[PDB]
Coordinates of C-alpha atoms in Angstrom, one line a residue:
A1 CA 87.2 -42.6 153.7
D2 CA 86.1 -42.8 150.5
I3 CA 85.0 -46.5 148.9
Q4 CA 87.6 -48.0 146.5
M5 CA 86.0 -49.9 143.2
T6 CA 88.8 -52.3 142.1
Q7 CA 88.0 -52.7 138.3
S8 CA 89.5 -55.8 136.1
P9 CA 90.7 -56.2 133.8
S10 CA 92.4 -52.9 132.6
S11 CA 92.5 -53.9 128.8
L12 CA 91.0 -56.9 126.8
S13 CA 91.1 -58.0 123.2
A14 CA 88.6 -59.7 122.1
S15 CA 86.6 -60.9 118.4
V16 CA 83.0 -60.2 117.4
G17 CA 80.8 -62.9 119.2
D18 CA 83.0 -63.6 122.3
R19 CA 82.2 -63.6 125.6
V20 CA 83.4 -60.7 127.9
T21 CA 83.6 -60.6 131.5
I22 CA 83.9 -57.6 133.4
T23 CA 84.3 -58.0 137.2
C24 CA 84.2 -54.7 140.1
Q25 CA 85.5 -55.3 143.6
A26 CA 84.4 -53.0 146.6
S27 CA 86.4 -51.8 149.4
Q28 CA 83.8 -52.5 151.7
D29 CA 80.3 -53.5 151.6
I30 CA 78.2 -51.9 149.0
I31 CA 75.4 -54.5 148.9
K32 CA 73.2 -53.8 145.6
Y33 CA 74.4 -50.5 144.7
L34 CA 76.2 -50.6 141.6
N35 CA 76.1 -49.3 138.1
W36 CA 77.8 -50.4 134.8
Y37 CA 78.3 -47.3 132.0
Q38 CA 80.1 -47.9 128.7
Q39 CA 81.7 -44.7 127.1
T40 CA 82.9 -44.2 123.4
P41 CA 85.0 -41.4 123.4
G42 CA 84.0 -38.0 122.5
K43 CA 80.2 -39.0 123.5
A44 CA 77.9 -39.2 126.5
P45 CA 77.9 -42.4 129.3
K46 CA 75.3 -44.8 128.9
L47 CA 73.9 -46.3 131.9
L48 CA 73.5 -49.8 131.1
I49 CA 73.2 -51.3 134.8
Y50 CA 71.7 -50.3 137.6
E51 CA 72.0 -51.8 141.4
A52 CA 74.1 -54.7 140.2
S53 CA 72.0 -56.3 137.9
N54 CA 68.9 -54.5 136.9
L55 CA 68.9 -53.6 132.7
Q56 CA 67.6 -50.3 131.5
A57 CA 65.9 -49.3 128.6
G58 CA 67.2 -49.0 125.2
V59 CA 70.2 -51.1 125.8
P60 CA 70.4 -54.5 124.2
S61 CA 69.6 -57.8 126.0
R62 CA 72.9 -59.1 125.6
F63 CA 74.5 -56.9 128.3
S64 CA 73.7 -58.3 131.8
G65 CA 74.9 -57.8 135.3
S66 CA 75.2 -59.9 138.9
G67 CA 76.6 -59.6 142.3
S68 CA 76.4 -58.7 145.6
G69 CA 77.5 -57.4 148.9
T70 CA 81.2 -56.4 147.4
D71 CA 81.9 -58.3 144.5
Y72 CA 80.3 -58.1 141.1
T73 CA 80.3 -58.6 137.1
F74 CA 79.7 -57.3 133.8
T75 CA 79.0 -59.9 131.1
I76 CA 78.5 -59.1 127.4
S77 CA 77.5 -62.3 126.2
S78 CA 78.0 -61.8 122.3
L79 CA 80.2 -59.1 121.5
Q80 CA 79.2 -57.1 118.5
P81 CA 81.5 -54.2 116.4
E82 CA 79.2 -51.2 118.0
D83 CA 80.2 -52.8 121.8
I84 CA 84.3 -51.6 121.4
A85 CA 84.2 -48.7 123.9
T86 CA 85.7 -48.2 127.9
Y87 CA 83.5 -49.6 130.7
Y88 CA 83.0 -48.3 134.0
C89 CA 81.4 -49.5 137.6
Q90 CA 80.0 -47.1 139.7
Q91 CA 79.1 -47.0 143.3
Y92 CA 76.3 -45.2 144.8
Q93 CA 75.9 -47.0 148.5
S94 CA 78.3 -44.5 150.1
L95 CA 78.3 -40.9 148.8
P96 CA 80.9 -39.4 147.3
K97 CA 79.4 -41.9 143.9
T98 CA 83.1 -43.4 143.4
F99 CA 83.9 -45.3 140.3
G100 CA 86.4 -48.1 138.8
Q101 CA 89.7 -47.7 137.2
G102 CA 87.4 -48.6 133.8
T103 CA 88.3 -51.3 131.1
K104 CA 89.2 -50.4 127.6
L105 CA 87.5 -53.1 125.1
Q106 CA 89.8 -53.5 122.6
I107 CA 89.5 -55.7 118.9
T108 CA 92.0 -58.3 118.5
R109 CA 94.5 -57.0 115.9

């Protein structure tokens, strides 16, 4: 009965400065209630985007988010060496809060 979040891609390899696009689709309409997290291994998850498209204090302006209803997109406009992590989307329209399989973001070669 839970909502399921299919996140794409699972892994990607890009170079510094590139555009990187991550999508999350919800199993049902979740309106605007989606969050985007990053996770450097060993540390705490940092919340970058709240309500699909709203940016948070302390995160670079190169992070952005868009989407509505059941399809949403996370975008890093110009990737930086510190952007290397794994990214998750979180639905919170209906409890329990469910999340996407995640995307492991990797440098080329």
